[PDB]
C-alpha cells in the first residue's frame, strides 16, 4: 500500500498515496486490498468504480456488494418527511465500522432544531457563488475507509463521498428566493469482502 518504491530512491508512486483517504481499520486491512487499490484507483489513490470494479472482483473475500447513495433535503415543508428520509438513510452514515451510538437521538437531536448537526465530518469545502438567490454553498466529504472483520479475519473496502448543500440564495423576506431552504445528499459505494455478521468486526 501507499507509494515505497525503487528506481526513484523508495518514494516516487504517480497515485502519491500512503494517506490519501482514512482508515479506521488501516492496521491490515489496507493491506488486504492494498496491491488492488494501488492498480484501478484514479491518481489521487481512490477506488474508481471504473476500473477498481474490477480491481473489487479481486478482493480478499468477496467483491463489489453495495453501490449506495441517500437523499436528505429540507425545506419549508414538515419534519414529516425531512427526518423520515434521514432516519431511514441515516443507516448510511458510515454503517460501516459504527459507532456506539451514531444513530437517532445522538443525530435526531438537532433535527428538533435545525439539524445544521454542528457541522458533522470534517468535509473538505466547495461552498457559495455569486448569485443571491441562485446558490450553492457545499462542503463536499470522500474519503475512503476500509473495516476490519476479527472473527474470520474479513475486511471492507469502502468510498463515501458526502455533500453538504447549504445554498447562498438570498432573500427570506417578505418573499423568499429560498435561502434557507437546505438539501443533503451523497454517494458511498462500498466493496463487501467478509461474512458481514454486525456492523463491527464483520468476521
Not at 500512503?18 to 494501488?38: C, K, R, S, T, V
Not at 458510515?94 to 451514531?102: A, H, K, Y
Not at 440564495?169 to 458511498?188: C, G, M, P, V, Y
Request: hydrophobic share 40%; with cysteine.
Amino acid at each position: 500500500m501507499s507509494i515505497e518504491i525503487y528506481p526513484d530512491d523508495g518514494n516516487t508512486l504517480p497515485y502519491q498515496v500512503f494517506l490519501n483517504l482514512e482508515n479506521e481499520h488501516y492496521y491490515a486491512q489496507a493491506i488486504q486490498l492494498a496491491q488492488l487499490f494501488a492498480h484501478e484507483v484514479d491518481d489521487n489513490g481512490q477506488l474508481d468504480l471504473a476500473k477498481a470494479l474490477k480491481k473489487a472482483q479481486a478482493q480478499p473475500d468477496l467483491a463489489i456488494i453495495a453501490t449506495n447513495n441517500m437523499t436528505l433535503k429540507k425545506s419549508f415543508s414538515t419534519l414529516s418527511a425531512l427526518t423520515t428520509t434521514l432516519s431511514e438513510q441515516l443507516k448510511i452514515e458510515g454503517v460501516l465500522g459504527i459507532s456506539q451510538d451514531t444513530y437517532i437521538q445522538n443525530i435526531l437531536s438537532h433535527a428538533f432544531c435545525d439539524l445544521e448537526t454542528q457541522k458533522d465530518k470534517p468535509w473538505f469545502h466547495i461552498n457559495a457563488q455569486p448569485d443571491a438567490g441562485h446558490s450553492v454553498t457545499s462542503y463536499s466529504y470522500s474519503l475512503f475507509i476500509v473495516s476490519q472483520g476479527e472473527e474470520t479475519g474479513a475486511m471492507m473496502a469502502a468510498g463515501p463521498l458526502i455533500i453538504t448543500v447549504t445554498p447562498n440564495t438570498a432573500i427570506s423576506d417578505i418573499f423568499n428566493t429560498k435561502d434557507w431552504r437546505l438539501t443533503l445528499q451523497k454517494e458511498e459505494i462500498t466493496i463487501g469482502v467478509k461474512g458481514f455478521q454486525v456492523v463491527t468486526p464483520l468476521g
